[PDB]
Amino acid sequence: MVNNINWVKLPVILDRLLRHPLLTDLNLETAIQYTLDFISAMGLPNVYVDKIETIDIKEYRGELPCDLISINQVRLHKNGIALRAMTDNFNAYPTHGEPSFKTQGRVIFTSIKHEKVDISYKAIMLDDEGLPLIPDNPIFLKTLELYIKKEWFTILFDMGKISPAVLNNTQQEYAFKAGQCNNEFVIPSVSEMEAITNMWNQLIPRVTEFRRGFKNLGDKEYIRVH
């Protein structure tokens, strides 16, 4: 992402929607739900807050933080060696290796019995209220506004209170801005294309960046003169 994510409260999206006199029955409560549907459906990893927590595994199980949304990596605390993924069907089960993890709910399922693990994860940024906080990006803000205008107009079109030409314009305009908003958040900055440059140009290919926290991923590869 080229621009920085400056945070603003959710009611800044309601100044923009209630400029439209057909969207004047909108609420904070409706703006809360349609934001989280929009934040999810875009899947932009720049909208989330990166956190790291150390949890302790009791017997192939550990309790996961409350704010966790997606795990970046799980690693061991004493080694720093990262855990990949549990493909075993019979993991902590005895009959009569490379460590792994698996997460379903608020429980993580590891391959190690009694160990502390660091979990680097993503959460949602909150307010003084326990409410979501959105980027002030006028591309993000415009297409979140067009998201809610397209969900409200879809209800109104089912009711028969909106022209099919009106909904077709809103469905088209949200469809353009959703790609512009995707490209706004995905396309790297100059400082991220340098780390992409160093990963791409490697005379001796570095193929074990998952073992670290992808720390040396964008590091530059140097060759001695001889």
Add this chain to the structure above:
Amino acid sequence: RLNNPSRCHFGIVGSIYNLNDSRPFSLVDMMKPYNYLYDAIHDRLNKAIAS
């Protein structure tokens, strides 16, 4: 030596295979760049064979 009393040495005889008072640019030294590059390209070959 028959005429110089100060001219002597030890048993140690040898030579540097150098050029004009410099440090020797050996045969391995001039082939070591291309051996290091052979090791890098055959690394890409082995990961392409594997995948």
